[PDB]
Amino acid sequence: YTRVVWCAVGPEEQKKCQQWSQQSGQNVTCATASTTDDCIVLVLKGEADALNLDGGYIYTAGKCGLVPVLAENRKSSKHSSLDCVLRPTEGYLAVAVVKKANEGLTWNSLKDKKSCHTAVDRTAGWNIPMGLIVNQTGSCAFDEFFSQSCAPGADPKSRLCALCAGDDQGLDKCVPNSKEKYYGYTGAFRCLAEDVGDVAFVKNDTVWENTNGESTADWAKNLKREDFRLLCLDGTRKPVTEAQSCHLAVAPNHAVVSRSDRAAHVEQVLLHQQALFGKNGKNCPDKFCLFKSETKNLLFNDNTECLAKLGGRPTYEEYLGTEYVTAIANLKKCSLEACAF
Numbered sequence: 001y002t003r004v005v006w007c008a009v010g011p012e013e014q015k016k017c018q019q020w021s022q023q024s025g026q027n028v029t030c031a032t033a034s035t036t037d038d039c040i041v042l043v044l045k046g047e048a049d050a051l052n053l054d055g056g057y058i059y060t061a062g063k064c065g066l067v068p069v070l071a072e073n074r075k076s077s078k079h080s081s082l083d084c085v086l087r088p089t090e091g092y093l094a095v096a097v098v099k100k101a102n103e104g105l106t107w108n109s110l111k112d113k114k115s116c117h118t119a120v121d122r123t124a125g126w127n128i129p130m131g132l133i134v135n136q137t138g139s140c141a142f143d144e145f146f147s148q149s150c151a152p153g154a155d156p157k158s159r160l161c162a163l164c165a166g167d168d169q170g171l172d173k174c175v176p177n178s179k180e181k182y183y184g185y186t187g188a189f190r191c192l193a194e195d196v197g198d199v200a201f202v203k204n205d206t207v208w209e210n211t212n213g214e215s216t217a218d219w220a221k222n223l224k225r226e227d228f229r230l231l232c233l234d235g236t237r238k239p240v241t242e243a244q245s246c247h248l249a250v251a252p253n254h255a256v257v258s259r260s261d262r263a264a265h266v267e268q269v270l271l272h273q274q275a276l277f278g279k280n281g282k283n284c285p286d287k288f289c290l291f292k293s294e295t296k297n298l299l300f301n302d303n304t305e306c307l308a309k310l311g312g313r314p315t316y317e318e319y320l321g322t323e324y325v326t327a328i329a330n331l332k333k334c335s336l337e338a339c340a341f
């Protein structure tokens, strides 16, 4: 009676989830929805139990009363004896990436350029960079700052969707799931790499995992790191090896959320599922790896080492930290105490 219904966002997640479901002997089964917001609503209703969320999505979910359960944890430096599940999480570095060739474009000349964003309301792709730009300009006209963008989840006929490409057929332009060619970390970095946009708002790790052979994927196999630079907030440009000193912010790790009344069942099952299909897991790479999806980042980021227990049974505000929570409150002025649903 601890069976968990995962929420898959879009059909490729759904496909991975079904393979997970089948491989788990139905300890995990799958609900599917078209956007993250719809998946949150399913969980609210009790029609799904859980999914992994970006930080901006944890905020929306948390005002609706959902709670973080386990955090994604990637490759670590200090405290590396301590086992992944126990090891605290550090956050990731939100960066703004450009082409080297595009000379002279800096954090200080982004007005009227072309922008690539993971999705609207995501941490590295939107909350951080738009939060900065509104604050930098005293202006809530964030939809008027770039000339065109791919910002999945924005109005498809607005300039915020003009660069979005939609699916293999050109359908679903600007939908916030992986059918949108330029959706997500890997999508927004693609948007930049094919020179559709002038800047992509992603995290530090995306640049590395999609260059210098780390990706075999079609558009990525020939990408070279030296061809990109990070935009720092002092107006300078740096190599993508300097993310530590040229980032826009540090982001709270993506975390599994659930209904509070289900949080404990979800926690146990996921710990158990990870021992079966995570990094060194009994059945990965043999039958199934929870943490791989050929760089599509389906249901978990592909760089995820393990899902880690959280210290202090945190609220969602505590999980996100009080800096990030205000920044998001401030930004949402352009648009306090209400669940959105």
Ligand SMILES: *[C@@H]1O[C@H](CO)[C@@H](O[C@@H]2O[C@H](CO)[C@@H](O)[C@H](O)[C@H]2NC(C)=O)[C@H](O)[C@H]1NC(C)=O
Pocket: 075, 076, 077, 093, 204, 205, 206, 208, 209, 214, 242, 243, 244
């Ligand atoms: C930014 O991201 C890259 C890619 O994740 C980091 O480099 C990896 O880090 C671990 C140790 O932290 C190495 O052992 C991996 O092999 C690296 N991956 C690759 C593909 O080279 C880098 O450390 C991160 N930088 C900062 C400043 O956070």
Ligand SMILES: C[C@@H](C(=O)O)c1cccc(Oc2ccccc2)c1
Pocket: 037, 060, 120, 121, 335, 340
């Ligand atoms: C308020 C709304 C708008 O466009 O006017 C908006 C702004 C930014 C992000 C959004 O995405 C969500 C999603 C769920 C709840 C609230 C906002 C929704």
Ligand SMILES: *[C@@H]1O[C@H](CO)[C@@H](O)[C@H](O)[C@H]1NC(C)=O
Pocket: 127, 128, 131, 132, 135, 326, 327, 328, 330
């Ligand atoms: C924007 O301005 C407010 C007011 O100073 C500040 O609290 C917030 O952290 C700023 N947001 C970002 C994303 O830097």
Ligand SMILES: [Fe+3]
Pocket: 054, 055, 122, 123, 124, 251, 254
């Ligand atoms: Fe994120």
Ligand SMILES: [Zn+2]
Pocket: 247, 249, 250
């Ligand atoms: Zn910093």
Ligand SMILES: [Zn+2]
Pocket: 312, 313, 314, 315, 318
């Ligand atoms: Zn607390």
